[PDB]
Design an enzyme around this catalytic site. Sequence first.
Site, PDB file in Angstrom:
ATOM      1  N   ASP A 171       0.875  -1.195   0.000  1.00 36.86           N
ATOM      2  CA  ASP A 171       0.000   0.000   0.000  1.00 36.86           C
ATOM      3  C   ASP A 171       0.890   1.216   0.000  1.00 36.86           C
ATOM      4  OD1 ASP A 171      -2.242   1.735   0.246  1.00 36.86           O
ATOM      5  OD2 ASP A 171      -2.695   1.173   2.315  1.00 36.86           O
ATOM      6  N   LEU A 175      11.818 -19.407  -7.014  1.00 38.98           N
ATOM      7  CA  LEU A 175      10.862 -18.686  -6.161  1.00 38.98           C
ATOM      8  C   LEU A 175       9.458 -18.887  -6.760  1.00 38.98           C
ATOM      9  CD1 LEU A 175      10.073 -16.397  -4.095  1.00 38.98           C
ATOM     10  CD2 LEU A 175      10.344 -14.817  -6.049  1.00 38.98           C
ATOM     11  N   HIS A 179       2.183   4.563  -9.615  1.00 45.06           N
ATOM     12  CA  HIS A 179       2.169   3.232 -10.123  1.00 45.06           C
ATOM     13  C   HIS A 179       3.432   2.768 -10.742  1.00 45.06           C
ATOM     14  CE1 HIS A 179      -2.344   3.686  -9.752  1.00 45.06           C
ATOM     15  NE2 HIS A 179      -1.779   3.303  -8.598  1.00 45.06           N
TER      16      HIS A 179
END
Lengths: 207, 208
Positions: free
Chosen positions: A10, A105, A27
């Site tokens: 956030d 991963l 963004h």
Amino acid sequence: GCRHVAIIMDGNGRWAKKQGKIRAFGHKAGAKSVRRAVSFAANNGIEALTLYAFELFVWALDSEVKSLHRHNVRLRIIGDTSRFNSRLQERIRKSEALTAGNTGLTLNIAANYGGRWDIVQGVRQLAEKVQQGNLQPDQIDEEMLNQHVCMHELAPVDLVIRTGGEHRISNFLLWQIAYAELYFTDVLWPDFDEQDFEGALNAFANR
Amino acid sequence: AHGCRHVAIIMDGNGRWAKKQGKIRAFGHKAGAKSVRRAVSFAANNGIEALTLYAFLFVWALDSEVKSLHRHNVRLRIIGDTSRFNSRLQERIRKSEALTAGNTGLTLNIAANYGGRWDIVQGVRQLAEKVQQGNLQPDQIDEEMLNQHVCMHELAPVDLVIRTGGEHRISNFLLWQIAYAELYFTDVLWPDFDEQDFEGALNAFANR
Ligand SMILES: CCCCCCCCOc1ccc(C(=O)/C=C(\O)C(=O)O)cc1
Ligand SMILES: CCCCCCCCOc1ccc(C(=O)/C=C(\O)C(=O)O)cc1
């Protein structure tokens, strides 16, 4: 000892506004922070990294998939993508299929995900089985519901990080976070860097 | 003014408190019970509608507090899996609930053998039963429906979760119910957690 880290990313909007810039600028800096966190987890032996941004977002990932694949990353999208356009759904299925055999991963990207939705989709599945006469109410247990919620094949979530100052899960993972460390930082997502990630890993190590 | 209708508390730190003073566990549990009475009174006097406590023979000799709760107009409920509890443990629980169910002040929920995952699972079983009776279609199951089957669904949503004692996890405590709750961790040990600490969590919820 930390195997699976989930992050509520956030603070992109607040960051943009602090920098005196529009939303899109936040963004773009957010996406750079995504790449840095992904690199860091892959470099440090974390097994699974699950990212929740708090169709346009998934589209941007599309051009990064070739590079994740080279890095032995397994990519999955979790969340309700069933009302996404079919072109995008197919691109998602292709990227997942491309990387599904990777052993480095595992990167889970939440897309239109909610923790309550996740539980409900798994309850729906059990309900279809009860109706088919294939299961008994009395047989449904924690183990069994667990097998029908997202990420049940992966290491348990060890650590949840929320950037951006709020102290809430905001209907990201619920079932899966029963025993996870919860680490909240005021740092905004675009600023969250390797040192901040390490600081969170220390909190876990102290637990 | 603070805005919480429903506070839930993971009450941890009793053992550590007693150890800090060279005392055995039972003195911590006892200080911790005093701190429960204090938190209960504080909630009742500050207009909270519901207070849900998770302690992390507790429930037994606690019968002995039900008369005192009743005199404070507190409505008592036990949440958790008490179905394998002793004969009459179950009966004394039912009578304690029955006695106080008409009370109009604070609703006090006490978790006894409670887990968040178990809570979801029992709700799913109620739903599976209705599917099997042919009453319910699998595709009618939505979040609002499952919400109606988890513990406490009839009370205000949980606004704030407090955990004392310094650890930063839920430890299986409300999972479905805390999707939107404020989470407040304090290093204060449960026996020391007092009205001003409670005020401090509420004012933190009000500001955040
Ligand atoms: C808002 C969308 C964010 C999209 C970022 C997706 C995560 C991509 O993270 C990456 C992490 C590492 C790398 C990287 O190592 C690429 C290479 O090693 C290579 O291409 O040879 C590339 C991407
Ligand atoms: C044994 C677990 C913790 C015991 C407390 C259970 C809930 C009791 O809550 C209370 C809240 C307030 C009061 C109360 O006003 C007590 C007194 O005036 C008194 O004990 O002298 C008593 C009980």
